Structures are given as C-alpha cells and as structure tokens.
Amino acid sequence: AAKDVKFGNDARVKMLRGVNVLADAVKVTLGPKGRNVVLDKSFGAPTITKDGVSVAREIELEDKFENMGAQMVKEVASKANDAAGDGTTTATVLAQAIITEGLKAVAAGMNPMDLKRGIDKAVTAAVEELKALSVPCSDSKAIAQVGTISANSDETVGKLIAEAMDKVGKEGVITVEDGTGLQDELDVVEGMQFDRGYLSPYFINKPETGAVELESPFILLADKKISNIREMLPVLEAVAKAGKPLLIIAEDVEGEALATLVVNTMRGIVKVAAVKAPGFGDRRKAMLQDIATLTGGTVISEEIGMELEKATLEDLGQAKRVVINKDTTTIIDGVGEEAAIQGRVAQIRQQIEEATSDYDREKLQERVAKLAGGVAVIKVGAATEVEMKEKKARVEDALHATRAAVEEGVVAGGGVALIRVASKLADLRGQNEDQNVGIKVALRAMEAPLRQIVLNCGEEPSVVANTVKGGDGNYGYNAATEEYGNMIDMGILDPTKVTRSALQYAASVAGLMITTECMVTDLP
Amino acid sequence: AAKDVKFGNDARVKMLRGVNVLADAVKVTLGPKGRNVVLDKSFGAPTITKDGVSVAREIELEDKFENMGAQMVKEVASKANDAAGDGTTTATVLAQAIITEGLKAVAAGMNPMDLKRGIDKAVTAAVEELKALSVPCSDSKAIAQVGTISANSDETVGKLIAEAMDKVGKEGVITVEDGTGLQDELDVVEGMQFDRGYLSPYFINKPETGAVELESPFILLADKKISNIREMLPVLEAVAKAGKPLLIIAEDVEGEALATLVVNTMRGIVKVAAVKAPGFGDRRKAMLQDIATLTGGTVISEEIGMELEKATLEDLGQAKRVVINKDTTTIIDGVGEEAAIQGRVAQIRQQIEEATSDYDREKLQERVAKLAGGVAVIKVGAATEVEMKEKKARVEDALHATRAAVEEGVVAGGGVALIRVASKLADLRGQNEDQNVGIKVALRAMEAPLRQIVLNCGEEPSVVANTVKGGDGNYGYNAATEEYGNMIDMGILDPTKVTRSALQYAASVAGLMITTECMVTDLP
Amino acid sequence: AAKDVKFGNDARVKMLRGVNVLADAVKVTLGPKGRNVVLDKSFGAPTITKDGVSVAREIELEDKFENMGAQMVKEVASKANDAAGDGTTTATVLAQAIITEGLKAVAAGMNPMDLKRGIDKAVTAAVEELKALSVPCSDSKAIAQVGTISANSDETVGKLIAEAMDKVGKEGVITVEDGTGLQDELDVVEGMQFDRGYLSPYFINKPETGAVELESPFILLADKKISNIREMLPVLEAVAKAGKPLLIIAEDVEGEALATLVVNTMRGIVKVAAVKAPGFGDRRKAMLQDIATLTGGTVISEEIGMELEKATLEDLGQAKRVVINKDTTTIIDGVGEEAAIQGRVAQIRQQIEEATSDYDREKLQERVAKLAGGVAVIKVGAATEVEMKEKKARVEDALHATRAAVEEGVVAGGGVALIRVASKLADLRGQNEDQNVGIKVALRAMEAPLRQIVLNCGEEPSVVANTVKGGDGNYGYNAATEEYGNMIDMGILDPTKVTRSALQYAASVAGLMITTECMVTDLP
Amino acid sequence: DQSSRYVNLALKEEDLIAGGEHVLCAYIMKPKAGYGYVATAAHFAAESSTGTNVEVCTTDDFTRGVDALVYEVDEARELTKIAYPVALFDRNITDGKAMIASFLTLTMGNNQGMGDVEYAKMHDFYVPEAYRALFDGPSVNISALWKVLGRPEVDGGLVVGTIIKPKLGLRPKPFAEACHAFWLGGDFIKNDEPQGNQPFAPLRDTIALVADAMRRAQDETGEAKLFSANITADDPFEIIARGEYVLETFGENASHVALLVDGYVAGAAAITTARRRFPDNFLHYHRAGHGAVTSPQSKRGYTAFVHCKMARLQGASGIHTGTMGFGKMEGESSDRAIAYMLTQDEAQGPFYRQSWGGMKACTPIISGGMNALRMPGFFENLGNANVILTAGGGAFGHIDGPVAGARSLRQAWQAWRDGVPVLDYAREHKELARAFESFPGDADQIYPGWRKALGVEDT
C-alpha cells in the first residue's frame, strides 16, 4: 500500500469504529438465542456459522485504518486458534474492551507505556490468581459435561467422546472422521491398521470382503527394497522347513514372487501373507523397529552385514492375530516387553521437541498409541455437509478443550472468575498514577465478556454484572435457563488455559497498539 | 477484497427477492399445468425445458446477494436431485414457505436454536409418519401408473417401464438412446453383451448380412501378448477333436498371426476368429473373471502356474451360443453352474455400495445385468434436438422415480400426505413453549406447497385445502381432472422416497439458514 | 515523469515540511513519555516500534521534493544501522537542528564554504572535548546500567545480559533466537558446534538418542573421502588395541563406511565416530586447520604427499570431550599446548587485521570467539512475534552499546555531557565573521537536541537549559526520574563514540544541504 | 481429512527417477527470512488456486490429494521437491482422460502476488526419458522440423535471424533487400513482437495483415519468403473449407512465415486439431529480454518456469526467466557463488555426474558478458541451449568479413558437426567483447566495460 501520514485522533477514532464494527459483527453470534453470521465468498459458498476463527480469517474492510486494525486483531484470533481454538469470541470482546478503555484513558493524556506496565503487572497477578483459582478436572463424567458444553448441549456427542477417551486411555489417540448418515458411530481399532492390499484376488479367504484371518503367524522384517528377487528363496527355504503361515513386510511383490506364492496357496502348498509397503523409507524406519519391539522380535535388515541368506524361523517374531481385506490390514497385538516400549518412548521424547512441532508430533503420538493403546474413529450422524462443518468444528473444539482441561483443570464459564478476581485484586498498585490507572482500567474493562454474554441473552448486562458481584463462589448465571444458580455445579466448566492465553495475548497486543501516535495509510 | 457489514433486513430482502424470482420461474412448472422456460445457450440455441435443477444451474443474476442466495438454494436443489431427482417445484415452494416463516420468526423475536430443534423433532415424527403412510408396490400395473405419473401423464413410458420390470427384473436396466424415426422402440438383450467388433477381411462369417454366429467355440485370454501361441497346436487339436468352430478372444495377437489364421479359415481346416481385448487391464480382467466363471473355465495368466502356449479342451471354458457383429460381441448361452453364479454374486455383495458408489456401481450393475438383470435400451424416434432433450429428461426422471418407488414405496400423490401428517401431528408438543411455537409454525408453513399447487390451477386455494383436510384417507382433489374423490382410484401416487428426502434436506437447510443475522458485502 | 525546476526558496520551502514531517514522525518517540509509531506492511502485520531508524527506513511521501529531502536525511539513519544502531533519534534531532540553522543562515546569507568550515571545526573540537571527557568502564554493574538504559531501564533483561556478558567473558558473542516460552533463558555453547549428526540409528553411544560423548577423544583427519579402498585399518586397528575412542573427519560417508561403523558400534570392536564435510571450501579449510592446530592434529591431505594407507599413529587429534547428537556435533574443548594455541590465535588475529573488514571477518570472529569465548544464547520468552521483534530491538541496542563501550568506554548520556562540551566549545573562534557565526549557529544546533529532550516530556525548557548550562559535573536531569541529581546516580552512561559518528555524519549532511541552490525533479 | 500421510517419500531425486511416472507441479515452500511462517502457507494455495465453491470431486471419486501432498525433503537446505500428482488421477480404458473439473482445481499453481520473487534460480528438475508411456511427448523444434535440410537437434541450426543495420523499419524487401539478399547471415528477419490486431494497437493494425497480399515475390523472383510478415489472423474460421487436403502449400514452417507469439493471447492453443500431426507451431517471439520485469525499476511479470515444463512443444527461442541477480549489496556469502560452484580449485567429486535419466539441451542464457577469452567460464554444464550465439552488434559493422561467423542459421550446422567440446557454443567468434560499446545494460558493475562511460578520470 502507498505511504501517507496521519496523526492522532484521525486514526484513533478510526481504530475505534474499526474494532467497533468487527466486534459487533462477531459478538452477536453467541448464545442459542443468537444467530450465526454469514461470511461472503462468491468464489466459495458464503458460510453462515459461529466459527470465530473462520470469521477472523474472513475479515477485510474498505477503510484503510479500519482494515489495518482488523488485520491486527486477526493476528490475536489466529494465535488463539494456534493455542486453543474456542472461546475466541471471548478473547476478541475482552481485547476490544481493554483497548477501547485504554484509548479512552489516553484521551486524557496519561503516559501510555506506564499504563501498559501497570496492566502487565495486573496480568501477571491475574495469571497467578488463575493458578490459585484453577479447579482440576479429572472425572470422566465432568469431561463429558465440558465436552458437551463445547458441543453446546449435544449430549450424545459428549457421551460418545467420553466413551472414546475412556477407551483410548490417557495417551491413546482420538481421531475424527467425516460422518455420512444420521447415526453417530464410535469405532476403536486395536493394534496397527494400515491401508494396503494384496493385488492377486486368489489370496481371498473364505469370508467375504477378501478377509484373511490368521493368528500366531511369523513377523518378518525387510530393510532393503525387495520386489521379486529370486534370492529370497533361501528365506523361503526356512519357510519350506516351517510349513507355517506367515506375514511378509516387503516393499512390493512382483511377477515371479506373486506367481509362486499364489500357486503355493491355491495348490495348498504354503499360505503366506505379503503386502505392498504402507509407507516409504521414513515410515518403515519406524515400522520395522516398532513392530520388532511390540512383537518382541529382533530387527532383520539386508544392509550393513546382516542379510536374508542368514536367518532363522525363530528370528521371525510372532503376533497375536492379523486380518486382511481388499485394501486394509490390521494386526491386533503382539508380545513385546514394556521395557522396550518405554525405551522407545524415552528416545522419542527427544523427537517430540522438533523444529516442525505441528503436523508431525501428531504422527508421533498416533504411532505411540497404535503401538500401545487404541485408535478412535467417529462418524457423527448428520444430514448435510455444511452443517457437518459446524459439527466437526464443535467436535475438534471439545477434543482440544478436553486436552487442556484434563491436565490443567477447569474453572466456571462465562468469565465470572475474571470478575471475582477483579474483586480479589483491588489493592494492587503501580509505581505512579499512570500504572494505577492502567490497573483500574484493566479491571474495569475485564468484566466485558460477561456483559456481552448477557446482552446475547437480551438481558440487562449491568444488573446481572451488578448482582453476580454480590454473589460469590460457585454461584453464577445460566443462559439456557436465563437465571441465577450454581455456576459450577450446573456444569459450565472451561479449561483455565484458554482464559490465560486469551488474556495474555490480548494484553500483549493491546499494550503495543494503544501507544500509537502516528500512522501510515494507502493512497485514496 | 475489502468487505463491509450489512445488518438484517437488507440482505434478508435480497435473498427474499432471489427466492421470489426462483418461485416465479418454478410456478409455471407446477403440476399438469407445468410449463417450460427458455434457458440461454451461449453458442447454440437456448433450451426450452422444465428441469428445475438445470434452471438452477443456469442461474445468472447481477445482484451479488441474490446470486449467493441462489447458490444456497441451488445447493439444496442439487442434493435433492442427488437423493430424489425431482419434486423441484416442491423444493422451491417449500423453500418459499421456509423463508416466509423465517421472516415471521424474525418478526417474533423468536429463538432460532429452539426453532430448529423443534423443527427437527417434528421432522423425525414426520419421518415416522411417512414410513407409516408408505405402501409397498408390487404389481406391474402400479409400476406403469407411477411411471406415467413421473413421465407427465404419458402411458407409453409407464407401460414400457412396466414391461422392462416384468421381463428383465428390477435392477437390470440401461440408459436411453433414442432415434430420429418419430416412433418408439425398446430393445432387450440377455446374457453377455460388450462392444467389440471384428477387423480382418475374412471376419465376415458365413451368416449373411456380414453377421457372425457360432455354436460352442471356446475363448480364453492369456493376460499377455499372444505371439508364439500362434503355434497353439494343443488348442487346435482339442477343438478339432471337439469338432467345433474356432473362436478365441485374446489379449493381443500379431497382425501376421491374424493373417495366417485367416489363411486357416480359407483352407477350411480350422475357421479361426478373434477380437481385441475387452478393456483396461484391471476392470477387463475382473469382467473376464466373470466371463470365465460363467463359462466354467479358468483364465490363463502370464503369471499363473500354467503355460501360455499350453492349453487343453478341459483347460478351455465352455459355452453354447455366440453372436458377433461389426460393432458388438454377444454370448447367448454359456456353460456355467449356478453355485459359481451365486459365489460371484456374494463377492459382488460388498462391492455393491462401498463408499465410491457410482464409479464402480455402473459396471457392477452392468455385470449384474449380465448375471441376473437385463439389457434394456429405449430407442425413441426423434429428429429434433429440442424434443429429444425434454424426452430424455422425462424418461430419466421416470426411471429414477420408478426405482425409488420400487425400493422404498409410494404414498398418495398431490402432496396430501403433507396435510395428513400435519393433522396427525397437529397436537405435537415440544420441550418448552419455544419448541411448541416452532413446531406449530413449521406445520402451518408446510401446507403452503399445497396452497401453491391449488392456486396455480386457477382454483379456490383455501376452499380446496380445507375441503381435502376435512376428508381423510383417499379423499382428495385431482388437479389434472380438478375434482374430488378417491385419490388412489384416481391413481394419484408419488414415491415416498422423494418426499422423505426432500423434507429431510429441507429441514436441514432451513435450520441452517434461520441463523441469518449479519451479512457481508463486496464492492460492485 | 517530466522534469520540474524549482529555484532557491522554492526548493527550500519544500524541504522544510519534508524533514518537519520526519520530525513529526520521530522526535516525539524518544523517552518514556515518548511513544511508538506503526509501520504496516501490506502482506504482513503492522509493526509498532520506537526505533527512529526503523521509521526512517521506509519513509516516503507523495511529494517529490519532500521525498528527496527525506532520502538525504535517511543516509545518517542507514549509517547508524551500519555502525551504531542506536542514537538514531539523536541523528534525527540533529537533522532538525541543522535544517533550522540552514534556513536561518539562508535568511542571513553566510557563505556555505565558511559555514561548513565552521561546522567541521566545531565538530572536531567537540570530538576533542568528548575524548577529554571520556571515562573508563570496566565493572559489571555499570555494564548492567548501560544495558538497562539501552533497554529503557529494563533491570531484569539488562541484568540478564550483564550476567551473560560476565560468564562468557568479553570474547563471548551472543546470537538471536526464537521465542517459545513466557520467560527468557540463557545458554552457553562451548567448542566447535556444527550441524553434524549420526546418519544411521545404530550410532547410539552410551548417552542414548544416538548421542556420542567421548572424553579425551582421538581424532583422525581423513581428507576428502574414502569409500572404495575403505581400509583405514592401519590406524583403526592400532587404536582398537589401544582401546581408545576414534573420531573420523571425512567429507562423504558411503554404505560401506556406514556398514563398518555399524559393525564397530554393535559387535563391540571399538568406539568410533565420524563427521561429514562442513560446507564451502573456505569454511571447511579454516575450521579444519584451526581444529588440527588447537588439538595438535596432523595436516592430512591427499592433495599433499599422504594417504590413509600411508599414515602415522601420531596423526591423531586430541580434545577434552565431544558430544554428538541427532543433528549437531560439538567439541567442548581441545587438547593443545599453550604456546601453539596462542600462536594460532595470533595468526588468526593477523587474519583479523584484514582489508576486507566485512562479513568474512565476522565469520572469522566466529572462529576467534571459539578460540577464546563461546556462543551465548538468549532464547526470549516472547509470547507474540511483534513483542519478540521489539524485545530483540531492545537487546540488540543493548548489545551495540556494550560492544561500543568495550573499545571506547562510556560518558554521561542524555546529552548532559554533550551540552557540557558544547558549552566548552562556546569559546571557539573562526577566521571571519562567517566562520564565527557558523560556530555559534552550531552551538545552538547542539543545544537543540537537549531542548527537544526537555519538550518530549513537556518540561520547563528555559529552567532546565539555564540550570544545566550554569551547572557542571554530574549534576543533570533524568527523564526516568524526571529530576536533577548526580550523573553517576542517574547512571545514563553511553559510549559516546557512536554519538561522535552520528554528529560527524550530521556535520557532513549539513554541509551538503547548505548547498541548496536549485532542484530538478520528475512529474508525479 | 488433513492433507498429508499419503506420500512419505524419504529418498532423494534418485527415488523420484526410479519411479519414472513422477511429474512435479507445485510451489517451493521456502519461507523467506523476513517473512514469517504463517504467510508462507496462507498465500500458498488457500486463495490463489481455484476459488473452490464448497469443494469438487472427480467421477472416479475419493481423491485424497486436493492439498499439496508434500513429500518435500528437508535435511540440508530445504531442497523442495513437491508434485501435484497427475498419474494417480482418473485412468480410463482407452483415453485415460479425467473430467472437466479434475485438472481445473489443483494442477494450476498460481504465484499471483506472493513475495517469493526476489531471487529464486531454479536449475534442473525435468521429466525423465520415461515419458512416452501414456503421454504424447514433444522433442522437436525448427532444428528438427526442416531437419532433413541440414539442422540436427541440439544447437544444430535454427530459423531465428540476426539483423544488420538498420535495426528495424523501412522493410528490407523494396530497397534494403541487400541486407536480406546476403545468405551469409541475413536469412530470416523478424520485427518487434508487440504488434498485431490487438485491442491496444496503433494505426498500423491494418498494415500487419496487409503483408499477406505482397507474397507475390516467392516463386517467380528466385527467393523464398523467410520474413516474419505479421499476417497470422486472429479469427480462425476461414481456412476451414478448402485448404484441408491438398492446397497446404503454405507449409509447416510456422517460423518462416510469421506467427504471433506475444505470451498473453496466443500460447499454444493449436493443440486441438494437431495432437499428433503438427504439434510444432514455433515459439515465434522476437528477441526481447531483460527490460520488462528483471529491472528493479520496472517489475512487470511473474514466475512460471516450473509450470512451463510442458511447453517444450513450441520450440522456445525465448523465455522470460529473469536474471542472474548481480548488483545491489553483496557479502554475507556473496551472490558470486555462480562462479564458486565450479570455478573453485579445491573442490572434488569422484563418483557421480549430471545424469537425470534423460538429458537434453540445458544451458542458462549468457547475460552480461561471457567471451571465449574467458574459456574457464560458462562451458562446464552443457554450454548451449536451443539458441545460437547472437549478441549486440558492436563489432559487427561490416558487410561480409568473417562470413562464416555471421551465418546465424547455417554456421551452427558446422559448429555442431565440427564436434569440438562445449566450445561449439562460442566456437563462432570471440570479438564480442567490443559489443559492449552498443548495449550497456548487461555489464554495469563488475565487468570493466562501463568504466569509460563515467566514474571520474580513470580507465
């Protein structure tokens, strides 16, 4: 954009009106009484939704100052999605309140940086106060309740999520799958299941779908790319002595190898399992080692010195049971020592700290769980794809919120903890008047998310915020019933991490943005 | 890319006008009084047609909000076409009812979340109701009735569909390819049928008019090049002992080998013919596996445990009758036992639906048509492209409607089931007053399609609606004959499947769209 | 586009607002009462910062003449980037002073030749007086003081940097690091660290994770690469009897070399590790020669009369301990004699005295620090990227101040020593009236920065000016405390030579701008 | 969902060569130091690929690779090798073709806006010799069209011409025909390319096509038309009726008779009718470069050299790749590494060479100055592209002189059939060092050819 200079209030009020539009575009979507917002995209399908991050990504305004402030506040929403992904509307409304009131104060001409320092002190005090006020969330029924809260009173999804989490255990992975019909379905895969199939239909067993079911087989490890090499026959020689069914982990099986294997099977000579590689070099580096550990076997390689020619039938490990079909194959379990399993966990702990972080630590955890725990697949029951968008958004939000809440605990929803701690932290003071005023304005503005929740209910925000302050402890307000009661015992519990991250991000960005004195803009 | 916000009524009226234009275009397509619309063609002449989904596909308006709302209703229209395929007039009028009741709810200050939930409960109850009202259809006469109803009161299509149903079974059907004759025609063929023609000059066999027909020749394909199986002496001597004409369909044979086969025919010792391999190696080999199973033989493979050049009369598959023309190859009678047929059907069972659906379904159904179904093609004489477009659309719609009726059944036509289920569910109650009001509004709006139907005939809407409501069972009003009486005796029947799917998708999209509160706009 | 000519005041007039705009951008920003300005990038997020040079770099307006005045004045900011990095606000206020004095001079009409003579004479006299006023700095607490004042009285991070400076010594050089946590952390890396990790997972030594930690290692220099001959056994086996660690230095490692290393690691022959090629020829030659000399290794090159087969057992290098991880290999310390080490450091200092005096010398400073100091790492606890940028700007300013004070030492900052030396330089005389006028004009020009400092906090200009000019010694004003006091107590101590360079650039740019005669520009 | 977990390629290009059926189409995800992470993926494929009303699918259905299925190998320098797969798409029985919307969604990576263009020189990753399996396969240029008349493939002749003074204008045939009447280098003249019947065209738009009615001097005169007489019409629906079968006397020489290739409105549209018969409509672009986007003052264009990998059908004599990137600020591993890659004395590699299972003419354009006196320079890799050594005419102010050298479309024949190393590219002549007296804008800072222009009294 072009460079043009503007000064003081010329940008300031723009900032104001800028945030003013963005927030009230978003704030109206909260609550069952509230509706969704329509995001315009002719190149796409304009989306009517409550997805805060989707709205934030969709933000772009005609006005120059409003547009730059909007891309500024989009960054905090993006960072929150990177951190939590839900409660984003709360972060936006609290950030709007604090920035607007800080600008209101600066309109009186106080030092912005001292105000920021006082607010930062208040933020740190609030962080340790949240540490004090955090309530651990351990029991699975409370986990289901908070997931349902994230699902906004979707009881079946909440109970299914609780079932999945209990079945996978502490470190078992949970995965979401695109639902098709109107029926919610939860499936648990035990062991390792990959998408690989035998090309020769002559391998089809008696049961339908081409499923071969085989228990107590022979774990085989091949590190070199073997496709149809006639030098394998010595290994077959051991199998020739064995006369037993077995599974082969090889790159692929080409003409001669498939021919001899098929004729052996159909003539009844020997039955063998051998399938195309699920993953490439990087994945097989993990798979051979982890299969050896889970099956209690020793890794078999063709490089370095060790090769196929020297081998033992007992050098081939064993499994529990394997099932094969057209393109999918599962192995239920194998007998391997826990000592090796946690040795691999310890060596992969160093892999956890990686330069990629996202997109790969997920695969690490999936691998660890499929070696140790089970894999959860959900197809949520729903009619159309546009609403399954919101369904899966709610699902992932509930999952991640549970990830935070299980370890870090929960606190009452609606921000009531923020108002209660603002009541707690009256006596905190700064160096001078500026820092004290910053603390005061932060504590005054931090009640805004709750008042906006009340407004979404179409009720008096001041009265509710003036009464709740009268109340304490677990007492609060229910929007579904639209009346007071026990805030906590009813079950609106949210991980404290989302609150911490929201307040911290909002404070960090607000302190730097409130201090602006001159600004640049594009040509008309 | 800069966007702006608009609030409530503006884009509300925008999509209101869009749906108004849609309903204006649709009303002329209502009932027996349904008329056609000109749809612009960029290069060629525009098409006069009634197809609502095509009209939606052609939607082009200057207004951005009108266009996006048009895309929104196009989405549900296309999903209805994917599920039901017709009732497009019903879809448009129910959409108009939906937007009208949404406007009423906006006027009411009503809770949209409770609205959609109550509508969902009412829709589940209505699903139960329609499952109750549906009646199985078995007689070919009712099938002809429903075909005529779907074909816009054309008895020829209904009787043609009934004939196909009676003779070639339920599933075995093929699409329509029509002529220029100005007359009608149906061709039905059973057995093995697939497009292959003969090439060499001799391949004009002994039957006149360039026809080829043989009794019990044995075809077998080696899955590889046929170069030295030009020798094939065991095959020649086996067939000579059998005293049968020589015909083998092979993967690929050299042109000079074909020439010396022609020389063999001319000398008369062995009269040998061949055609090109069926198709792509994988699907070709699957269908050839089917062919071999029907012929009771075992396919020769380049990588099987038996020699390409070695074959025996017992190694050959067996069949009775074959007819080959310049275009298409046909096997009339093959030597196969029914247990193999049912085993192939069993291995079909899983591949029937899968997830891919259409892509593997088509050939599978063709395969089914070869096994138990039938080959049915309609050749209607029509020189004008304009009439053949509409004829094709109508016959495809009639086909799909007949299939839907066969699988799920029918209820009474004319939409009377709407008022019947409304009366049976008039006293439906929800969780709270909000659910009760939402259900009541949905019930009130869902008769609007019927009021539209009656008014578009230029007759008393309220009077007819109330009179039909007062009666019950088969008491109903015929718009085609415009008279009250027994609706079934009048043969006014519509498949239950299309109504159910349309109602369910209508409920989904309505619950999604009732959340319209704030909208985004772009530059002109 | 087309050329436009402006003569005398016509250009001069324009020039005014140009720097005025720049002044409006920059002057208000300095000090705790000073604020920050937003510089946005179209693709990225806006950056709000206080660094004046950061503002200056992207300065551009619509007006041609103002833009060209701005690009002259940006030269001092760029040179500050190159040499100092801070005091950029001082350069800008110097520019404002010189433009005011230039307009006044044009108003009176002195000869620019005599004007620049007086300017440079006054500048040199100021340099002399500042050198007279220089105060040595050696103790760590003053280091912390200067770090804090550079970070705007940041006691926490300033003390962190002072502590790091103390523990790594003067030769320790610090780097810039990404921010992950909420708190800063300090890391010290000793010896040669490089991106070299084990290729095969079998290379795991005792400390797991493929980490090889060897005390007093024995290092082989295997110039270039060895695959086909593959027999380093004359020394390999000898040290195998010696039962001592092995280190290999080769550019490439092949399947055979990996195989035999795996043999040694698994079968238990002897502990052996190898290292790949470093990189470019210059860097690899440097970091192998220095290591061999420091470790007492033998210069081994097949480029010279030498072979792996033609080798001596004395070729081994020796270190204290080496730690190899998945990606990084680190030499903690090397075993060498003191005289040889100091001689090699002397020759690398002879390399320091290089005509290049550029980034080649910086990569040499890497080697020099590894000779004497170590790698210092401050991993910031920044939450967001923009606050990370501001933090790193602060720490880099502190680093610049510390490094400048290392060679020069510090004198009273905040302009108190500057106004003191200007008051001394108030007795300067010139050759003619033009020169005397230029000298006294320079006196007010140097008075300007301090009075703008006063007005930045909006304080009494005349009172401060009088009470400081009359005063002497450590009596001065503090903006952090906003009060008079001892300079040592205030502790704003600055390596003045950065201000020296800034003021001589200011003298040069004043001398060029006093050549304002006529200008030709392009049409917009 | 997600995007990855479908292709885990963990080996270098060697594995990408063994497969043979690997076709690469994607954008390099090298986040620029200065541009931070989020924008690298935000503007990669989220808003510049398709528009994507909801989402689309192919008739085969269930395609797992809508997003960038990145197998990029990242261990040393983040060497990016990413492909939009095409071989895994819908495979049919006879044609193997997909539907209308299949390719329209994923295969056209668009770098329309993102800052990834400051310096990005992409050297060699090319579709191997295993390309004729289920693809057409172009390997023909004008050096292979009239090949039977004396042009072999690689640097073996051409039809692109050099012009003697005057540069252009006052068309040669009436009076300046002596410039074209010299078979010694005046053999195929072309005019400036930004012309034709374009919407933004001057009054000369009528003249261009009018050049057709003056083809009367090719049969009875004794000379064959080899000028780029810009008569290629925009509206095609006139040739349909008569010329199909016999009257094709115009000839396949699309680079002898004119052809309009401006790079915006023509491209290679000829694919439809001539899938197999005439896939060779020569890339008829007048030799203009280093004046549109390469200049930091005037940057008007984009980068598509990766996507141009299918374009070898045209027979390119010009492609707007960019520049070597010399000037501005050096140091910090100075950008002179162009020399440091091979000219360094103490380097060594014993084992492998440049063999990517299907080599072809591949040599970067001589920009700035590269004379045969600097024989230790540019002749290492291949030394020649589908072009002929032709630079500014600084020392070329003579009628015949070294008659052999000026043979633009004839001396290449000898200079490639002489068979004397990579010197063949510059075997012609070496006095080109004087050509800097004419064209300054190639050697500006490093080469001493500009020292005489300005820079105080020194030489």
GROMACS .gro file of C-alpha atoms in nm, chain A residues 27-35 50 152 414 448-462 464 476-484 487 492, chain B residues 109-112 434:
model
   44
   27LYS     CA    1  -2.039  -1.070   1.938
   28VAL     CA    2  -2.393  -1.121   1.808
   29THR     CA    3  -2.328  -1.487   1.728
   30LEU     CA    4  -2.308  -1.602   2.091
   31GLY     CA    5  -2.585  -1.796   2.259
   32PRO     CA    6  -2.865  -2.018   2.132
   33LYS     CA    7  -3.088  -1.711   2.113
   34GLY     CA    8  -2.825  -1.550   1.892
   35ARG     CA    9  -2.787  -1.646   1.528
   50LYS     CA   10  -2.045  -1.928   1.459
  152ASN     CA   11  -2.330  -2.663   2.315
  414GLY     CA   12  -1.883  -1.701   3.143
  448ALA     CA   13  -1.699  -0.702   2.939
  449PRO     CA   14  -1.713  -1.066   2.815
  450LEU     CA   15  -1.977  -1.149   3.076
  451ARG     CA   16  -2.182  -0.838   2.998
  452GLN     CA   17  -2.168  -0.931   2.630
  453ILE     CA   18  -2.287  -1.282   2.716
  454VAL     CA   19  -2.578  -1.119   2.899
  455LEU     CA   20  -2.652  -0.896   2.600
  456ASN     CA   21  -2.658  -1.203   2.375
  457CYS     CA   22  -2.932  -1.326   2.609
  458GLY     CA   23  -3.115  -0.996   2.559
  459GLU     CA   24  -3.099  -0.903   2.928
  460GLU     CA   25  -2.963  -0.620   3.140
  461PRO     CA   26  -2.582  -0.656   3.148
  462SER     CA   27  -2.527  -0.408   3.431
  464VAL     CA   28  -2.653  -0.919   3.604
  476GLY     CA   29  -2.350  -1.768   3.873
  477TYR     CA   30  -2.589  -1.728   3.582
  478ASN     CA   31  -2.728  -1.985   3.337
  479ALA     CA   32  -2.816  -1.864   2.988
  480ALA     CA   33  -3.010  -2.177   2.891
  481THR     CA   34  -3.237  -2.121   3.192
  482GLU     CA   35  -3.161  -1.746   3.188
  483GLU     CA   36  -3.149  -1.731   3.566
  484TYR     CA   37  -2.910  -1.747   3.858
  487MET     CA   38  -2.247  -2.175   3.806
  492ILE     CA   39  -2.028  -2.485   3.268
  633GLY     CA   40  -3.801  -1.212   1.816
  634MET     CA   41  -3.800  -1.592   1.830
  635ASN     CA   42  -3.519  -1.823   1.943
  636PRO     CA   43  -3.367  -1.984   1.630
  958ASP     CA   44  -4.038  -2.221   2.206
   0.00000   0.00000   0.00000
